[PDB]
Ligand binder design. Structure first.
Ligand SMILES: [Cl-]
Length: 349
């Protein structure tokens, strides 16, 4: 397990996925006054982002997940009393305490027997949420699980920082998991390297402020905002993720060309292109929606499913690989069959 823990589940399936994005659409024009048009043009070419959605002050990740959840439950026809666990994966919770999972439990009318867990993960979070939820179902702790995976990273961006300002958008998602009777297996790999903490971090805002003054890379940066060392993240990613993809493919037992899609965290288009090439993946089978939504952090994979795979999922079972990487450092994969599904949708606030 030198390159991550290998995990297998059976007896659980994805039953539906809904994404909810802010109705506020922010075009690149927005940024030309503060940043030079030429510089904006060159950066957005590389990152691939034409538009993104930004939450207003009264809209949180929890709110986006609640609205997605309402739509998902209505579509599935699942009664609130039937939900056994809700896991909220986010870096932008409502409160320091209580956890936002409790707010969602109450707002969705879930029962007292519904487990409520907030877990702090970023870009690597979706495959981990899938694994945890499917493990709960396999082990008989649950029959129906909701995964509320969302973020409003726009609220942590320094508006004077060009790289982060142009990159991030906001989204919230809800994924339904249910007990399944087939013999189909899901495979996951989950890895961590906390030595990367200082390369993707919000220095101030928690209970042990990072020593930003002592870090030359942070000169002129706001400590309450997101810091990213792009060069370090690129090198981390280009090394760890192709190995993750290879090993995931090997343990899932299916030929590369029999996958319907390889769903990557939408880090930036330059990175996505480099990863697909290094992993020898066919570019047409690597969906991208960063152009319309920006990088939506932990929401990026489920948002990709709803915006890019809705029509294909209606009709067939898809063989999917999912690869998340980022903050922690952390990286994670899922490889499994999904669908057909009728409840796959993208709504706005
Ligand atoms: Cl451009």
């Amino acid at each position: 397990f030198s390159a991550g823990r290998e995990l297998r589940t059976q007896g659980a399936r994805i039953a539906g996925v809904v994404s909810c994005v802010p109705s506020k659409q922010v075009d690149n024009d927005y940024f030309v006054e503060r940043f030079d048009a030429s510089a904006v043009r060159d950066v957005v070419k590389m990152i691939g982002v034409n538009r993104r959605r930004w939450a207003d002050a009264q809209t949180s990740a929890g709110d986006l997940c609640r609205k997605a959840g309402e739509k998902l439950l209505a579509g599935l026809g699942w009664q609130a009393d039937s939900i056994d666990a809700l896991i909220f994966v986010s870096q932008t919770p409502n409160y320091r305490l209580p956890a936002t999972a409790f707010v969602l439990q109450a707002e969705l009318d879930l029962p007292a027997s519904c487990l409520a867990l907030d877990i702090n993960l970023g870009c690597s979070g979706y495959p981990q949420a899938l694994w945890l939820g499917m493990n709960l179902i396999q082990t008989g702790a649950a029959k129906r699980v909701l995964l509320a995976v969302g973020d409003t990273i726009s609220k942590m961006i320094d508006p004077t920082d060009r790289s982060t300002s142009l990159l991030f958008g906001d989204a919230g998602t809800m994924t339904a998991l249910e007990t399944s009777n087939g013999d189909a297996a899901a495979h996951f790999i989950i890895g961590a390297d906390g030595k990367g903490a200082r390369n993707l971090i919000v220095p101030s805002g928690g209970f042990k402020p990072y020593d930003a003054a002592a870090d030359e890379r942070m000169a002129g940066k706001s400590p309450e905002c997101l810091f990213m060392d792009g060069g370090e993240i690129f090198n981390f990613t280009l090394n760890a993720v192709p190995k993750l993809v290879s090993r995931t493919l090997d343990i899932a037992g299916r030929d590369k060309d029999s996958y319907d899609a390889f769903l990557f965290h939408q880090a930036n288009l330059f990175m996505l292109k480099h990863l697909a090439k290094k992993a020898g993946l066919p570019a047409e089978r690597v969906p991208v929606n960063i152009g319309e939504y920006g990088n939506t952090s932990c929401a990026s994979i489920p948002l990709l499913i709803t915006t890019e795979l809705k029509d294909r999922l209606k009709e067939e079972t898809l063989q999917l690989g999912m690869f998340g990487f980022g903050v922690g450092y952390s990286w994670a994969s899922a490889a499994l069959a999904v669908g057909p599904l009728n409840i796959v949708d993208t709504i706005e606030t």
